[PDB]
Structure 1
Amino acid sequence: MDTEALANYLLRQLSSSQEYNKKLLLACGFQAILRKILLDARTRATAEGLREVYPYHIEAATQAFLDSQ
């Protein structure tokens, strides 16, 4: 699934070069924020210390993300 395919997804839920660039940048933002959520999940996984990023780590990452944004 391409980053421009993520832009296509955001286009499908949202609704030509200028709009193309706008939607590509929106896809960049969505991808970066997904990466941020996963990175904060890894950070929470560091606090607990077991093998892998169990689901409540992504959960806690989302609450911290909302509490800071």
Structure 2
Amino acid sequence: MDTEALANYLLRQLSSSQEYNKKLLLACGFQAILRKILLDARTRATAEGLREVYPYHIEAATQAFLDSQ
């Protein structure tokens, strides 16, 4: 499932070429949010020592992220 499929998801959520580029940049930003959140989740899991992450880890990470945003 490519990034263009996520752009299709976003356009069907909101419903030419320049708006396609805008939505593609939006999909890239969404992937950046997910990657940063998962990186914070691993950082906190390694801080606690657990090999995997858990829902409370990533909930705390995303609350700390949205606190700054």
TM-score (norm 1): 0.90
Alpha-carbon distance in structure 2 between the residues aligned to 1:42 and 1:22: 30
SS in 2 for 1:66: helix
Q: Deviations over 1:18-39 (max 9, x none)?
A: 1110110010011110111111
Deviation at 1:55, TM superposition (A): 1.6
User: Aligned-pair distance for 1:57?
Assistant: 1.2
Aligned-CA RMSD value: 1.0
2:19 paired residue number = 19
Q: Which runs of 4+ in 1 moved over 4 A?
A: none
Query: How much identity, in percent, do the aligned residues show?
Result: 100
What number of residue pairs does the alignment pair up?
69
Aligned equivalents of 1:61, 1:18: Cα separation in 2 = 34
Q: Can you list the C-alpha shifts for 1:37-57, whole angstroms capped at 9, x where unaligned?
A: 111111111221112112211
Instruction: Name the SS of the counterpart of 2:6 in structure 1.
Output: helix
- Give the corresponding residue for 2:51: 51
1:63 is matched with 63
Unaligned runs of 5+ in 2: none
- Check conservation: 1:44, 1:60, Cα contact below 8 A: no
Deviates more, 1:50-59 or 1:24-33: 50-59
